């Protein structure tokens, strides 16, 4: 209730340069983001805690009962800030400082071990990372493979000519119409 300001959010020490009679702090969205504390000249910026989107990696429920959790765009040492009870709605504390932690360009995911081979992509993650449920079964995270490497023996007096042929039949499915509805 700082001199008539009501809201919610942790208070952190800030070092912005105010002016002799500048009390409030206004952001682009016209919301408070800084307050001059009464009885002091201190300035505190009002922001929530370490927050973002929480995603769950999982195979089918029937296949297994295991999950992996990815926090989007957070430093991997700033996630264990809220390992407590009555502090978070999510109290699953074994996943914060838990299994093999691997840091990606989209935050660090916990519960999957990073192997350093490469296969095709099964469950996309982001920035060239994919996850799969391989074998003794556990979830792993690897880097995508673009395909099999190859090289052509180019020369200025060499040509290659086929001597046989194969015939293949391929399918292709296209939608053409949908259901008619009246209300």
């Amino acid at each position: 209730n700082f001199n008539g300001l009501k809201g919610t959010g942790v208070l952190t020490e800030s070092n912005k340069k105010f002016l002799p009679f500048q009390q409030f702090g206004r952001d682009i969205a016209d919301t408070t983001d800084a307050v001059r504390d009464p009885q002091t000249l201190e300035i505190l910026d009002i922001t929530p805690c370490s927050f973002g989107g929480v995603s769950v990696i999982t195979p089918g429920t029937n296949t297994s009962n295991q999950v992996a959790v990815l926090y989007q765009g957070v430093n991997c040492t700033e996630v264990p800030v809220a390992i407590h009870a009555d502090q978070l709605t999510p109290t699953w504390r074994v996943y914060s400082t838990g299994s093999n932690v691997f840091q990606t360009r989209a935050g660090c995911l916990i519960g999957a071990e990073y192997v350093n081979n490469s296969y095709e992509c099964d469950i996309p993650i982001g920035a060239g990372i994919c996850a799969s449920y391989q074998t003794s079964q556990s979830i792993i995270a690897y880097t995508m493979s673009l395909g099999a490497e190859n090289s052509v023996a180019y020369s200025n007096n060499s040509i290659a000519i086929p001597t046989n042929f194969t015939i293949s039949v391929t399918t292709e499915i296209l939608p053409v119409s949908m259901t008619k509805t009246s209300v």
Partner: protein, 322 residues
């Protein structure tokens, strides 16, 4: 995010949100469908090859000079000389004020992976002709390959060999003019410039829309409780939730229009690379301006750039015919 955008960090409003209920969940499934599609548009264009070829060390392709489009190993990023001019010509605290549940997800394919697909297309289309897009890749000298590109236009193959040195110079000269032309002006990259401008402007109006009263007593949620009686305060707060829910709806609807337009353009780049790049096109004014010979792809931020090579008749003379 549903809850944090409209009245984030206020538990006295979150229970009020359950009254409307499944309205915002429809928005999440709408925006998530757009994001998944963007990862398929890129896949259809650059991933038309089952092999990752690489060029041999020798760079004598019959006199043609391809050094301006092949990757440069010296640079930390394996991007060609031309591709560097494009990355420095597209301009993208701005994202720090997005604590309202607005996020920018990262693309599935990193920009260093797309340059590997593009380098495979180039290294397979100069050592094997068009034969790698219809089966096993078969090598062919570049000097002879250009003879079957003239032969498809309608000009015999005895004119390329008799003018091989002159044709090589014209190709090399025109390939160095593009480098200076791109760095001369800045309006050539306009098509990709407004794609990111529209998205940045759309989010800005969304953020500024939560500072509007919507005709109510006060914009901020906290003082409404402290300035009105509890018997009728619940009427005013839901009268403010409607505006913050309609505003989020117009943003989603506008994106659905834009996504279809980009989808119709990502289906044209896939055709332009199947036909012009992996073959020779007889369609007029499709892969350039004139008689088509070949094309080369290049990668740009959120797009692709083609380099069409054509054939144009020079000075002519009148005649009498029967």
């Amino acid at each position: 995010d549903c809850t944090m955008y409209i009245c984030g960090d206020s538990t006295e409003c979150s229970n009020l949100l359950l009254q409307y209920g499944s309205f915002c969940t429809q928005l999440k499934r709408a925006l998530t469908g757009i994001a998944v599609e963007q990862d398929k548009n890129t896949q259809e264009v650059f991933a038309q090859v089952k092999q990752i070829y690489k060029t041999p060390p020798i760079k004598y392709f019959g006199g043609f000079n391809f050094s301006q489009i092949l990757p440069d190993p010296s640079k930390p990023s394996k991007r060609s000389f031309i591709e560097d001019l494009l990355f420095n010509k597209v301009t993208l605290l701005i994202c720090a004020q997005k604590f309202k549940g607005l996020t920018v997800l990262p693309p599935l394919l990193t920009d260093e992976m797309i340059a590997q697909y593009t380098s495979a297309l180039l290294a397979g289309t100069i050592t094997s002709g068009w034969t790698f897009g219809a089966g096993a890749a078969l090598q062919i000298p570049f000097a002879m390959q250009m003879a079957y590109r003239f032969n498809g236009i309608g000009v015999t193959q005895n004119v390329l060999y008799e003018n091989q040195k002159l044709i090589a110079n014209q190709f090399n000269s025109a390939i160095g003019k593009i480098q200076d032309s791109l760095s001369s002006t800045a309006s050539a990259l306009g098509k990709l410039q407004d794609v990111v401008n529209h998205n940045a402007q759309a989010l800005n109006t969304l953020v500024k829309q939560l500072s509007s009263k919507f005709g109510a007593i006060s914009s901020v949620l906290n003082d409404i409780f402290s300035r009105l009686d509890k018997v009728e305060a619940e009427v005013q707060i839901d009268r403010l939730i409607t505006g913050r829910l309609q505003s989020l709806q117009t943003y989603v609807t506008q994106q659905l229009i834009r996504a279809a337009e980009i989808r119709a353009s990502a289906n044209l780049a896939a055709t332009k690379m199947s036909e012009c790049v992996l073959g020779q096109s007889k369609r007029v004014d499709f892969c350039g301006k004139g008689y088509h010979l070949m094309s080369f792809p290049q990668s740009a931020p959120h797009g692709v750039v083609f380099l069409h090579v054509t054939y144009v008749p020079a000075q002519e003379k009148n005649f009498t015919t029967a």
